[PDB]
């Protein structure tokens with residue numbers, strides 16, 4: 001059975017107006033801004049941006065890759081696909 005989400009989990013993250021996007025649950029660094037209650041820090045591969053999202057918008061990567069892991073025109077997406085597949089736990093600072 002599933003556990004709750006935890007830092008390092010790989011997902012497709014969905015925001016309004018964007019296709020399901022390769023992403024990870026981030027850690028919060030000591031001294032860094034924490035997300036709101038009930039939200040996780042989501043690092044989106046390719047664009048390297050963070051947003052705060054709840055589980056409803058988070059699709060586990062293994063299960064979802066066959067549907068969502070196809071090239072997309074949007075900026076950063078295809079770079080994103082390479083990252084999540086090839087070095088999803090790397091520092092992208």
Ligand SMILES: CS(=O)(=O)N1CCC(O)CC1
Pocket residue numbers: 015018021044047048049050051
């Ligand atoms: C799916 S995306 O384009 O990487 N996206 C992440 C950050 C958000 O605020 C909007 C842009």
